[PDB]
Subunit: 203 residues, 4 copies
């Protein structure tokens, strides 16, 4: 019995790499951006978006805001070390940050099932975690292939489970390979869920 | 850094379970069947199929020949133990064998990349292994999803490769989940590569 | 330029086949079942289910309730005709109804991205359609494979679009092949969305 | 009853676009290249590869030989027209050619089932077509998902088959989206099956 074709999930505190980022300093940084983003607040109500995003609103956040430059600098090292875990042949060129956005998720807020095209590593760092429930649902890529295969026991190892629920603490970073189907479950607590998500490309 | 959504490959000597199956007795059994099955030879001639199979010409081989009944009994226990490794919820129903066929592959023969529909576990026991070449190439179920992803380094870990190569010895039995794409690569020595393949489904 | 490997979507009014089912008669039938289902109402609050379902509560609805027997009888013919469109080799055995459940979806209610294992044809008939928005999101099965492929134009044919939005009228039935990834979008209207979903198996 | 998520296969005579490419002149070009590329012959000998390829031994063939530059110009227009059939949003960037190689396949040669990573459009023009046998077997991207689904009838429509077989004439050029799994089946006549294959990616 041998383990093959493994999906790897990178879960580590942000303080393992890069510069120091004060957690309380960046909670308010996300709020000050959200409440100055007139076009972002405007787009979210127009689209029926459950919460706030800067994704289709503000692009270069590390250039505009100094703490985000420090965040990226830390994220680069997190990603580079994850690339080494994934044993990617990268030649000379490393993985570079492609997209980076902010998310504020109030009570009842969810993200649908989605992936991230034209990207190698995707990930999310966590600024505010109330509730103590799952901030990430993560689906088996082989799920569609398993149509005749019986369901797993209630009870099995996490290697085998077809849905993986992640409960990250504040200041944690989660990375995954960009093809991974992932979902952000409904915020069950009254207070906000603040996260910063990002994509890393190669060429 | 966690390992998720694992494909599990069972690999064990057939003598671990069931009654004694004499390797020399099994080899002559397959030759005797193949040279009496004139409809099987005829179907391989009419199709232009590389080698011999009993896949389209014979059905329940254990009902007909005593040594295959002794094989099936062993395979039952093999599969049931592999089902417990995979931790399927099987309820009342055990996994039963629906298909079992003989392959006799000569110098230059190949099988295209393929899966096995309406099955839970698929597998192959090996009767004749000449040469130092691979009898199975497994392909990553995630391969098509990895269109933007860089290739793994030549010296990467086994759980991270796109393609896995197995060189079984005589009397081995391999098992996999039926949706796993596999290829039987080209035989290189001038002696026959004999194997018995089989499909298990859920009642 | 040639069109291959097509996913087919069956969209037709329920009155094209089977017995007559009065629309107003069955709106209240679903309500009378939901408000008698003590175990179903109990399970939905316990699970945090956005709305009502009878799926993990009441099984044989055509046996218990006469209008649902008439519904199944009509659905059988809808499915059988769709099997002919799909050109399935079925031998003697037809497609039979495996599971059948009721769904009531109030304002804010959604279903996550999901498929239906151990099934051939899945579908939903629509009892109450306010809003005039989409009651079905339908995702490309090749979506995960298209990671390096650029996004389609705003503007293209529906063959090509990676997400298909369906706006069914009252009394419509939608059928699809069970492996299809599909989502029920958020109910934007104040009034309820009543639907009856079902699975069809083969063997 | 609608047709959704279509795979599109481009098939047209190479003379529809670009400059005049003499078929007899192209055949002798490939033979001249293959019998001078001693490193290419050597790489096929060292790998035990069925036939000849320039895939690992030569890079930019249009920069070196005039007739291939005249080929590339034609292929550019071919692909760009196929991109418009697929209706990609390409922005400022056109699709450029990154890889182009020669295949010379003899009596008995085959290529395994495979895709082309980091590419948008892949294709093959055909230089020599002896016999009445297939030069391409396409496999349904949905094949692994159809594990519970019944097989299509032998007499089913082309858009519904799991496998599609193409028999091009000389001077034809086929295109497909790069994620499409394809197999080049076994050559059956004692003359060479020559083809030029190529990969297009997005700038
Ligand atoms: Ca290298
Ligand atoms: Ca003996
Ligand atoms: Ca021997
Ligand atoms: Ca020899
Ligand atoms: Ca039949
Ligand atoms: Ca001429
Ligand atoms: Ca000739
Ligand atoms: Ca010959
Ligand atoms: Ni995301
Ligand atoms: Ni096989
Ligand atoms: Ni559903
Ligand atoms: Ni190719």
């Amino acid at each position: 019995s041998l383990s093959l074709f493994v999906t790897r999930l990178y879960h580590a505190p942000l303080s393992d790499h890069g510069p120091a980022i004060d957690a309380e300093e960046m909670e308010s940084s996300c709020y000050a951006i959200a409440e100055d983003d007139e076009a972002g607040q405007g787009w979210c109500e127009e689209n029926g978006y459950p919460g706030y995003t800067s994704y289709a609103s503000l692009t270069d956040l590390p250039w505009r805001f100094p703490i985000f430059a420090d965040l990226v600098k830390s994220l680069d090292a997190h990603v580079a070390a994850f690339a080494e875990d994934l044993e990617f042949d990268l030649d000379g060129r490393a993985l570079e940050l492609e997209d980076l956005w902010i998310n504020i998720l109030p009570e009842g807020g969810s993200h649908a099932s989605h992936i991230h095209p034209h990207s190698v590593i995707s990930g999310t760092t966590y600024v505010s975690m109330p509730g103590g429930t799952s901030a990430l649902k993560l689906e088996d890529p082989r799920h569609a292939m398993m149509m005749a295969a019986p369901a797993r026991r209630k009870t099995a190892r996490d290697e085998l489970r077809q849905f993986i629920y992640v409960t990250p603490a504040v200041g944690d970073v989660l990375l995954w390979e960009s093809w991974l189907r992932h979902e952000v479950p409904m915020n069950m607590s009254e207070d906000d869920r603040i996260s910063v998500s990002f994509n890393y490309r190669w060429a």
